[PDB]
Design a protein around this ligand. Structure first.
Ligand SMILES: [Zn+2]
Ligand SMILES: [Zn+2]
Lengths: 48, 357, 223, 43, 242, 302, 80, 44
């Protein structure tokens, strides 16, 4: 995405469903949120 | 005439295909059919409960005695088998699952493969030399199996390959029949191609209410000689019948000894003149239990309770029967149900003998 | 003698030379069962007795050399199995030359590597399960049809009415499946659906609780 | 190595030998599902 | 377990709520008390019946999980895609052949008589009669406009153990459901009696599915071509406002 | 899987060599560079008795006996000597001291157990005594499951000295408690082993190898596993292998219509019967080939 | 390491038509391969290699499991 | 070794006459291996 992009897709808006498949930028944004689940799950043991 | 309209069809190689023709002719010099071929048998049953048909199917699948090829302990000669990849476990797993149609338990084979070439040599099933027992006038297994492969300069020597008997439930190598069809001919079906009905089974009656008594069952046998197909399949069917009868007769020896304290039969006298019978038999499957429940239920329409609970982790079948009669009357009804099962499978025997010429 | 035998019997070079000797029958196909058979195998493979290996100084000079010397110049491209045999024999011969630091070695190594790469191409041809592509019938190649989202600038009439207010689609309009059922249509709120709608009705369209227009009739507004 | 180093951390004297314990007559295995067992029963 | 090939610690799936466990590869310790003093206290204090009610949230811990929650819904459902949800006498008895409780009396039934799931559930709840009346998880006003709810499935009522109407689901039989069926049984008959009914009602739910079936497929997730156009038309409105 | 193509030449610790491997019916571009590891097990997505709840699976016993996910598991024993103090040999009761209670020294041959014999718990696999008359520093096989001595050798270490190397092999089948997984990350533990006559079967005779709970999907949203079953079901009948690499153009609506063109249903579900009773389900069950892989977590070691 | 003797699912004797199915398949691929390197066959994006009729001519039934295991099983001889 | 093992790992000997536990053996102590100044050692 270009610098100072205005479209909502550039900021994590995934327009597609799982049954229809995601594109490369949508999968990267999904991995950004998916990695947080793995990180917070690890912290949910030690920090607790 | 419970069992009518049987049709038998072998599974044969189509030599009209050039690729298959050339491959077979240059591999095994094969230009005609193999000595042993699979056979699909479709059977129509009328006026019989689905419990009996399904029990016959189960017995033909993995409760009928059957023969395999096994290696005696010490048969795999470590002193001579120099191959590093054809381990004993792999080779014996290959050998156990070769479908055989044996005549006696005396035949003993041997596999002596020497690789004097510079390329990997494939050990086929035609390299099994019979070393003990009467000489075979007809092969007992197909010569086109792939037992293994040897690296250059390696060897594989195996002795004491004998024929072992067992039931398919204990080990899958004794499995006999593979399922190919099962349907009820007295229940209508929806067209399931439509998107309105593709989520349903298809039958127009729920299994919670339906009681079909006109079935079609089609089973495939993996190895039957070409010139005696009708002789083999018939035998198989007949065999199954005897097995079921035999097992049922075991229960018939329990009810006959209800006066003496017997571990496998327990009788209680409940309230309101109700009697309870618990029959616990070890190493029994859903076949005998389902047959017993179905025939007791048919014999006693107003029975208080009947169940055939077969427990996986207990390896046993517990049949509970609660009925508002006395102990003697309950035992009489149970014996009548057992006799009904016996006569039904005797009629199946007779129909099998009558149909397949 | 014991330490020398233990060292050499665990050398993969010894096993490879022994395999080559087994192929043409210089040593028995079975591994030795007695010390005499082991000594004979050592003498045939290494080429020197273990006693005399400790006396003299070389080691690689007299290791087995295959008996059949095929013509490897047909490796210059009943033929394919013979090609495999030639590949195996030349691999052994070149490995033995590498051990002995033979002159004119790197060029022959490169030539045989090219030959074995061609043979590997053939072997990979033999090792294909197959492949399939679901072709688009309209085209003649791999299907490109997808159910992905495609952006499209909808008219502003879909979000705002003719008075500039936003739409609030919150009235459910239900129409009778059969004609005889009356009334023909019922307009209910989400709270009243369970209390006024039965299976004799079907959801036709939504309605805005501000401008009172059907969602399917939103295009009749003047943009 | 020192005497007081044995005390502090998780693998120390207090948290590994006193607050915790290695015991005999105990078993460990992977758990599994079994719908024929009661809620107060273990296979 | 007399089978020599079994090396795992098997337990009921409804017992996982005590340990926050599952069967993805978890390992659990087990030691059998041998001292008389420790063996007495295990039976009286540390029995799992003492923690059916959570000491944390003061509510029940155990219930139906993932097959007897949807199994109880299908069993207690009023209408089946193949007509009314009834079963003959033979299949009504088959639902009670695994519960390991005493069987009910089916003598007052012809082989062609039909029994609905409410009657079958009732014969099991007569042992511990309770009073329950709530709205099941099946009913949701989110789904209401686009669904035709059955008026006999959105009101679960039980008086004296007789399931008068409604379906049984996570609200009534689910694990951790405060005020649920098993919470009421524990308060009136004891936590051990509630555990036996969890197992007993689990078997009817599982035995119903033995010939009713339950599956998930790819077409269960696929929008129709007309509905796909409606989904992206909705998303285009969001991108238009954005 | 095939953990190494030169496994027989190696003495490795805790290594499993699965005999049978299959290329997935829906392969990817990653299989152009590495060997696939797993089998195309026929999987039924159904509730069957409640033994597959909470991320468990039901495994056909016949599939186990035929070699499904079956292989050999290896362990090694590397024992060293003290130079001129210790030695390899069978001890004698009347000279050597503090022999291990309940041991079995009779299986030793010249200090090592011969290759091909079965060593069980309590057996002394390597004989070793230190000369003081003698003290017994023997090595005993402390494992519950019996092993088979696969390879015995006496190499020379970096210090030019003899040490004993023994390779023990284990015949491992798939048993209850072994962990399996799909390619979508839905792992599971084998819970029940049913015979070939107790597994459910379709009208056409198809029966599952694994029975997984349908409740494993909705919370984890592993849609690629369900699409793989739909695509792979048509590939088997059509006799083809297709590519399912990520970010390739797919249309599940078109893939579902491809099933009907092959004689199946649109949804891929089929009429099935209960193997224990012979009673058909009142619902078409989604059954098809899904590529499953055995994770190397053995209950016989944990 | 080879095509199984029997189908892993049901146990149909797949092995007795295994070897032939291997070799014949190769020529069929050679018919459809087309100006392409062998190791690049699974990346051609233009191939239509169908083995339905070959397996049918072998006499093997139209079972999903049997054809799946016949087609997809790897051969150790072809990689080592 | 008449009985190779009774499937139960035991670390103790028993009397052959009555069965009483004689003693137990798990491992050798091996602490006297260090028996009894780098200077005199370096000199020797
Ligand atoms: Zn408006
Ligand atoms: Zn099959």
């Amino acid at each position: 995405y270009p610098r100072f992009a205005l479209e909502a897709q550039a900021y994590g808006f995934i327009c597609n469903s799982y049954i229809a498949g995601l594109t490369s930028p949508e999968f990267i944004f999904g991995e950004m949120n998916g990695r947080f689940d793995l990180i917070n799950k690890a912290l949910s043991t030690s920090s607790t | 005439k419970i069992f009518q309209n049987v049709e038998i069809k072998p599974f044969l190689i189509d030599f009209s295909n050039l690729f298959i023709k050339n491959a077979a002719k240059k591999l095994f010099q094969l230009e005609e059919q193999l000595p042993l071929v699979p056979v699909n048998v479709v059977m129509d049953f009328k006026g019989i409960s689905r419990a009996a048909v399904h029990g016959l199917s189960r017995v033909l699948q993995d409760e009928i005695p059957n023969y395999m090829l096994d290696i005696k302990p010490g048969g795999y000669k470590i002193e001579d088998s120099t191959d590093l990849f054809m381990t004993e476990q792999f080779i014996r797993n290959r050998i156990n699952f070769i479908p055989i149609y044996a005549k006696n338990e005396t035949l003993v084979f041997a596999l002596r493969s020497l690789n004097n070439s510079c390329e990997v040599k494939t050990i086929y099933s035609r390299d099994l030399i019979q070393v003990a027992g009467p000489k075979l006038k007809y092969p007992i297994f197909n010569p086109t199996f792939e037992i293994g492969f040897l690296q250059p300069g390696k060897s594989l020597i195996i002795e004491d390959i004998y024929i072992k008997k067992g039931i398919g439930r204990k080990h899958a190598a004794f499995n006999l029949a593979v399922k190919t069809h099962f349907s009820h001919l007295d229940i209508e079906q929806y067209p399931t191609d439509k998107k309105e009905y593709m989520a349903l089974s298809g039958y127009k009656q729920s299994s919670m209410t339906s009681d079909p008594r006109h079935h079609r069952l089609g089973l495939c046998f993996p190895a039957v000689p070409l010139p005696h197909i009708n002789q083999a399949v018939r035998t198989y069917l007949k065999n199954a019948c005897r097995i079921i009868i035999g097992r049922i007769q075991s229960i018939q020896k329990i009810y006959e000894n209800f006066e003496e304290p017997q571990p496998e039969l327990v009788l209680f006298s409940m309230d309101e003149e109700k009697t309870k019978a618990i029959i616990t038999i070890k190493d029994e499957t859903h076949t005998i239990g389902n047959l017993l429940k179905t025939y007791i239920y048919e014999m006693i329409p107003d029975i208080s309770f009947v169940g055939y609970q077969c427990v996986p982790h207990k390896q046993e079948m517990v049949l509970t029967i609660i009925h508002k009669a006395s102990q003697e009357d309950l035992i009489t009804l149970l014996e009548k149900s057992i006799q009904n099962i016996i006569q039904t499978f005797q009629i199946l025997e007779k129909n099998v003998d009558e149909l397949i010429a | 003698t014991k330490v020398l035998l233990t060292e050499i019997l665990l050398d993969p070079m010894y096993d490879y030379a022994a395999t080559v000797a087994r192929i043409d029958g210089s040593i028995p196909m079975h591994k030795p069962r007695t010390p005499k058979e082991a000594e004979y195998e050592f003498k045939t493979v290494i080429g020197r007795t273990p006693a005399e290996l400790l006396s003299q100084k070389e080691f690689y000079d007299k290791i087995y050399t295959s008996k059949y010397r095929p013509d490897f110049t047909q490796l210059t491209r009943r033929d394919e199995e013979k090609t495999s045999t030639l590949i195996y024999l030349r691999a052994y011969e070149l490995f033995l030359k590498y051990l002995q630091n033979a002159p004119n070695f790197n060029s022959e190594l490169a030539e045989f590597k090219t030959y074995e790469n061609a043979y590997g191409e053939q072997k990979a041809l033999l090792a294909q399960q197959g492949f399939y592509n679901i072709f688009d019938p309209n085209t003649g190649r791999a299907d490109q049809r997808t159910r992905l989202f495609e952006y499209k600038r909808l008219p502003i009439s879909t979000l705002y009415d003719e008075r500039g207010l936003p739409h609030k689609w919150t009235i459910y309009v239900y129409k009778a499946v059969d004609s005889s059922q009356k009334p023909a249509e019922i307009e209910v709120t989400r709270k009243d659906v369970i209390k006024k709608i039965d299976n004799h009705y079907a959801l036709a369209d939504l309605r805005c609780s501000v401008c009172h227009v059907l969602q399917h009739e939103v295009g009749q507004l003047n943009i | 190595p020192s005497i007081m180093r044995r005390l502090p951390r998780k693998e120390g004297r207090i948290r590994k030998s006193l607050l915790g314990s290695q015991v005999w007559s105990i078993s460990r295995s992977t758990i599994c599902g079994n719908s024929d067992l009661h809620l107060d029963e273990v296979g | 377990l007399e089978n020599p090939k079994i090396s795992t610690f098997q337990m009921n799936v409804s017992a996982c709520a005590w340990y926050n466990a599952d069967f993805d590869g978890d390992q659990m310790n087990l030691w059998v008390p041998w001292s008389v003093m420790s063996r007495v206290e295990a039976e009286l204090l540390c029995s799992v019946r003492n923690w059916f009610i959570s000491t944390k949230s003061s509510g029940p811990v155990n219930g139906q999980v993932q097959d007897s929650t949807v199994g109880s819904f299908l069993l207690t459902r009023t209408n089946t895609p193949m007509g009314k949800n009834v079963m003959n006498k033979l299949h009504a008895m088959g639902l009670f052949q695994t519960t390991q409780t005493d069987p009910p009396c089916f003598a007052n039934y012809s082989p062609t008589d039909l029994l609905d799931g409410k009657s079958v559930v009732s014969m099991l709840l007569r042992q511990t009669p309770i009073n329950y009346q709530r709205a099941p998880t099946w009913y949701s006003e989110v789904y209401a406009p686009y669904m035709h709810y059955n008026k006999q499935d959105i009101s679960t009522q039980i008086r004296n153990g007789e399931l008068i109407e409604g379906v049984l689901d996570k609200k009534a039989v689910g694990a951790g459901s405060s005020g649920g069926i098993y919470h009421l049984i524990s308060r009136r008959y004891g936590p051990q009696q509630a555990l036996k009914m969890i197992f007993a009602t689990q078997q009817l739910a599982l035995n119903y599915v033995r010939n009713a079936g339950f599956t998930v497929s790819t077409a269960d997730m696929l929008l129709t071509p007309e509905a796909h156009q409606e989904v992206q038309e909705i998303i285009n409105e969001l991108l238009l406002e954005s | 899987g095939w953990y190494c193509f030169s496994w027989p030449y190696r003495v490795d610790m805790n290594r499993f060599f699965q005999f049978y491997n299959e290329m997935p019916l829906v392969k990817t571009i990653a299989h152009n560079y590495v060997i696939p590891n797993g089998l195309n097990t026929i999987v039924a997505y159904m509730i069957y008795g409640g033994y597959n709840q909470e991320d468990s699976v039901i495994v056909s016993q016949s599939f186990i006996d035929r070699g499904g996910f079956a292989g050999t598991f290896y362990r090694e024993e590397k024992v060293e000597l003290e130079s001129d103090i210790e030695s390899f040999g069978k001890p004698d009761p009347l000279i050597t001291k503090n022999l291990k209670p309940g041991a079995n020294y009779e299986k030793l041959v010249d200090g090592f157990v011969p290759v091909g014999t079965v060593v069980k718990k309590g057996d002394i696999i390597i004989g070793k005594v230190a000369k003081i008359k003698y003290i017994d520093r023997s090595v005993m096989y402390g494992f519950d499951e019996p092993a088979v001595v696969d390879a015995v050798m006496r190499p020379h270490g970096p210090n030019d000295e003899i040490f004993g190397l023994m390779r023990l092999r284990y015949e491992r089948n798939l048993n209850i408690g072994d962990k399996m997984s799909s390619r979508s990350g839905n792992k599971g533990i084998a819970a029940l082993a049913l015979p070939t006559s107790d597994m459910p079967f379709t009208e056409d005779g198809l029966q599952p190898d694994l029975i997984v709970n349908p409740h494993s999907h909705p919370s984890r949203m592993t849609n690629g596993q369900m699409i793989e079953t739909t695509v792979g079901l048509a590939n088997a009948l059509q006799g083809v292998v297709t590519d399912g690499t990520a970010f390739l153009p797919i249309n599940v609506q078109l893939l579902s219509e491809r099933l009907a063109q092959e004689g199946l249903r649109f949804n891929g579900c089929q009429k099935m019967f209960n193997g224990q009773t012979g009673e058909y389900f009142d619902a078409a069950i989604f059954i098809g080939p899904t590529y499953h892989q055995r994770l190397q977590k053995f209950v016989l070691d944990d | 390491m080879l095509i199984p003797v029997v189908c892993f699912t049901c146990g149909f004797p797949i092995g007795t038509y295994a070897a032939i199915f291997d070799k014949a398949r190769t020529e069929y691929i050679k018919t459809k391969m087309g100006g392409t390197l062998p190791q690049n066959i699974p990346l051609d994006a233009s191939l239509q290699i169908e083995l339905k009729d070959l397996i049918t001519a072998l006499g093997i039934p139209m079972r999903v499991c049997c054809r799946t295991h016949l087609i997809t099983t790897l051969d150790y001889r072809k990689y080592y | 070794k008449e009985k190779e093992n009774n499937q139960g790992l035991i670390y103790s000997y028993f009397c052959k006459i009555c069965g009483e536990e004689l003693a137990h053996f798990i491992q050798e102590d091996r602490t006297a291996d260090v028996g009894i100044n780098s200077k005199l050692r370096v000199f020797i």
